[PDB]
Amino acid sequence: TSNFRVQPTESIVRFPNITNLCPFGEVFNATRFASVYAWNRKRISNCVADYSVLYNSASFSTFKCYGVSPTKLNDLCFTNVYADSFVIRGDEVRQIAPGQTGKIADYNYKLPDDFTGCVIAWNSNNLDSKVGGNYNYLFRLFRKSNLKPFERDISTEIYQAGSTPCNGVEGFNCYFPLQSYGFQPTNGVGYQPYRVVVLSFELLHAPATVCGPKKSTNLVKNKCVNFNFNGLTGTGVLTESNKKFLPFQQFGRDIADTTDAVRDPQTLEILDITPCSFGGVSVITPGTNTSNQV
Amino acid sequence: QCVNLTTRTQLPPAYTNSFTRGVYYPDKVFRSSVLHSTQDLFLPFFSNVTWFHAITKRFDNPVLPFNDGVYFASTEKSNIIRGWIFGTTLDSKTQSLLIVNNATNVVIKVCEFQFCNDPFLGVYYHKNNKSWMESEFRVYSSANNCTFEYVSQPFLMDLEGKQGNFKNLREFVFKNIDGYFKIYSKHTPINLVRDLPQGFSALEPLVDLPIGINITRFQTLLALHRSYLTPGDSSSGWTAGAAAYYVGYLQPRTFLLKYNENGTITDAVDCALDPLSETKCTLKSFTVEKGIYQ
Amino acid sequence: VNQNAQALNTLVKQLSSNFGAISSVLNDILSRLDPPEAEVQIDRLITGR
Numbered sequence A: 001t002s003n004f005r006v007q008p009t010e011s012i013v014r015f016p017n018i019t020n021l022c023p024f025g026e027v028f029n030a031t032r033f034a035s036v037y038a039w040n041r042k043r044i045s046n047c048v049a050d051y052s053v054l055y056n057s058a059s060f061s062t063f064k065c066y067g068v069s070p071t072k073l074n075d076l077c078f079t080n081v082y083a084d085s086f087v088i089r090g091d092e093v094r095q096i097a098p099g100q101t102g103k104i105a106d107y108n109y110k111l112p113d114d115f116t117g118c119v120i121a122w123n124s125n126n127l128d129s130k131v132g133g134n135y136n137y138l139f140r141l142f143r144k145s146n147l148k149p150f151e152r153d154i155s156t157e158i159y160q161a162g163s164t165p166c167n168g169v170e171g172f173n174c175y176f177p178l179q180s181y182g183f184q185p186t187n188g189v190g191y192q193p194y195r196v197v198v199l200s201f202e203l204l205h206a207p208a209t210v211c212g213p214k215k216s217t218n219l220v221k222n223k224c225v226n227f228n229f230n231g232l233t234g235t236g237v238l239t240e241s242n243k244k245f246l247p248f249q250q251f252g253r254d255i256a257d258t259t260d261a262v263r264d265p266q267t268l269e270i271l272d273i274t275p276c277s278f279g280g281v282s283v284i285t286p287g288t289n290t291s292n293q294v
Numbered sequence B: 001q002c003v004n005l006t007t008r009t010q011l012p013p014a015y016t017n018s019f020t021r022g023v024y025y026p027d028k029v030f031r032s033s034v035l036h037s038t039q040d041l042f043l044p045f046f047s048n049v050t051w052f053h054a055i056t057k058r059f060d061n062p063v064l065p066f067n068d069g070v071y072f073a074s075t076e077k078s079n080i081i082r083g084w085i086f087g088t089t090l091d092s093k094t095q096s097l098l099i100v101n102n103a104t105n106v107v108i109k110v111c112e113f114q115f116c117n118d119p120f121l122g123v124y125y126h127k128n129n130k131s132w133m134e135s136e137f138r139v140y141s142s143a144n145n146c147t148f149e150y151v152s153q154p155f156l157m158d159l160e161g162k163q164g165n166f167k168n169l170r171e172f173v174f175k176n177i178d179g180y181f182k183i184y185s186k187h188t189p190i191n192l193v194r195d196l197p198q199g200f201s202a203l204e205p206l207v208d209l210p211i212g213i214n215i216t217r218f219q220t221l222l223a224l225h226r227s228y229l230t231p232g233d234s235s236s237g238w239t240a241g242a243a244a245y246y247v248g249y250l251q252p253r254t255f256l257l258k259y260n261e262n263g264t265i266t267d268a269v270d271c272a273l274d275p276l277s278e279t280k281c282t283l284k285s286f287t288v289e290k291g292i293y294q
Numbered sequence C: 001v002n003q004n005a006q007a008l009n010t011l012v013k014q015l016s017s018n019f020g021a022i023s024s025v026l027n028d029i030l031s032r033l034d035p036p037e038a039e040v041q042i043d044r045l046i047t048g049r
């Protein structure tokens, strides 16, 4: 007739004990930003990052996330987050994204085809506009080959358009690949400068260095419960285990791909995980004609 | 300062065979009593490894290509081997890793260095008091900028020349993947002098560093012995001592690894060595019965 | 006996396949994603299994 399943009694969250905060101030509140042809990369690790702020505040122009949903970034633990900072034009904001080929994408900064991160961009016209023209920002236009993802080129050599090799003369059919942006307050919105940061994070089996601002609860054993071990969500029964983990090991997969053992972050204990009880349910009847007992 | 060593006689290189060596734990998951197939950079079985022996004066410090990875095995009795440098050009124009185990402690510094032509660590021996003290540090001239630095806790070692046979073998695997310098290590007591032992011992991960630099060349560092017996200047008044090490290179291969009940690798099958190994891969077993197999 | 065990082993091992989705675990897809974006990948997993 049906199936029988035991239901969880409670839920438990076990996240590492780090009180440090992530230096978002350096990233977004920086007085100066580098050029697009040489973007700036920073690593953020061993800190707590709150993505609820910087999403409902500062009125960021574009907040587009690929592979994750922003509401869930509070509930996720990440490994080795990177921040890439540069300054581009308004229309070029479209070009920096998965696919979406463009001159910036082709010759300045290429995002990987498989991307899991959030691109944030805001309008900094007032800061980066000079009445005489803000010429401190430069961009690349002529490169021999398309850039590989997450790569930057700083080579400044005279580009050879056709024959007659330049040999450093910058003559006919010889142009400098680097050109200076001209930014002034009296310009169109599309031509106004924009400041862009790209947050890219890797989901790995390695212990999660960065974790959301989510509290922890006490451990419970021998009962069907939900568990949230470092973003690993499951339902089952936890028991003490005699498995002999080596110090670098953190999980256990048994023969299939499913996890069967785990290491409690705070107390460094090995816990065996077993599924809750399930089975079929059958009804034995002598026939409605004879009786209604079962 | 930098001094070009002299009184060194060049000899043709020597080659030996690696008999089932260079197997490490691929990931951090725990598995027990299973046969697991892994595709990764491994040292192929029964392969040429270049063998260097410092004993002419045989000052064996040649710069070697890094390639995709390195398997370095040193048979040591007097701690002659100290450390390594890893650099694309090593001329202070391109930044270079240095991992040096000096008398006080291990020091892992990624800093632009003006490396000397013949880097080494000159340890001086005094006759009036029988002791060895490191005095010359000829690794580099100066450090322009130090993006990454790390000094470990102090410790003391004998640093005394031994007139016996080689008693310990130290195996290391160095890789650069995803901007990560991974070092796997192990040590085994063996009495062999000039032959690489024929046995199996897995290498546990030792450290994963976020160096993130481009490496295409590396060099070893030796402990130079100076005493009253050797007369001359820094370039001539020295003796090499007795030491031996072996260098092999990693290649992308598929391996079948056997885990025991304690979750330790005990045996491995190289998949593309010969047809019988291929049948063992296909059947997922270490024993094959009589018959014909696709 | 060997044939029955082999069939069951293939059936269980088949759960690890992506079938084109981002991952082979439903609990990971349910997080990290909103329902309109999660439904298509859950569909791919359903079809394969």
Ligand SMILES: *[C@@H]1O[C@H](CO)[C@@H](O)[C@H](O)[C@H]1NC(C)=O
Residues within 6 Å of the ligand: A024, A025, A026, A028, A029
């Ligand atoms: C930047 O500074 C303002 C105060 O001037 C502050 O409100 C804001 O939170 C700061 N942003 C970051 C990312 O620290």
Ligand SMILES: *[C@@H]1O[C@H](CO)[C@@H](O)[C@H](O)[C@H]1NC(C)=O
Residues within 6 Å of the ligand: A017, A265, A266, A267
């Ligand atoms: C914090 O976690 C560490 C392990 O990372 C543990 O040894 C320590 O006792 C914990 N402290 C608290 C506040 O529970």
Ligand SMILES: *[C@@H]1O[C@H](CO)[C@@H](O)[C@H](O)[C@H]1NC(C)=O
Residues within 6 Å of the ligand: B002, B003, B004, B117
């Ligand atoms: C070693 O030889 C090189 C190349 O001839 C030279 O540039 C360097 O000055 C020499 N170092 C000495 C003599 O200490």
Ligand SMILES: *[C@@H]1O[C@H](CO)[C@@H](O)[C@H](O)[C@H]1NC(C)=O
Residues within 6 Å of the ligand: B015, B048
């Ligand atoms: C490679 O191994 C073979 C084994 O017979 C040996 O003869 C040879 O000298 C080694 N080195 C090269 C470069 O072939």
Ligand SMILES: *[C@@H]1O[C@H](CO)[C@@H](O)[C@H](O)[C@H]1NC(C)=O
Residues within 6 Å of the ligand: B102, B103, B104, B105, B107, B134, B137, B151
């Ligand atoms: C070894 O290196 C460390 C770090 O540079 C230094 O503090 C220490 O004095 C050095 N010791 C020797 C023996 O040179």
Ligand SMILES: *[C@@H]1O[C@H](CO)[C@@H](O)[C@H](O)[C@H]1NC(C)=O
Residues within 6 Å of the ligand: B144, B145
């Ligand atoms: C490296 O050091 C030189 C000399 O002090 C300095 O001019 C240069 O800006 C430094 N570069 C970096 C990236 O720190």
Ligand SMILES: *[C@@H]1O[C@H](CO)[C@@H](O)[C@H](O)[C@H]1NC(C)=O
Residues within 6 Å of the ligand: B088, B214, B215, B216
């Ligand atoms: C590393 O440097 C070498 C020599 O300068 C160069 O050929 C190679 O392309 C570089 N690799 C990367 C990833 O920059």
Ligand SMILES: *[C@@H]1O[C@H](CO)[C@@H](O)[C@H](O)[C@H]1NC(C)=O
Residues within 6 Å of the ligand: B260, B261, B262
């Ligand atoms: C596992 O470790 C225990 C404890 O040292 C040992 O008695 C046992 O023999 C080991 N198992 C194997 C297969 O070596």
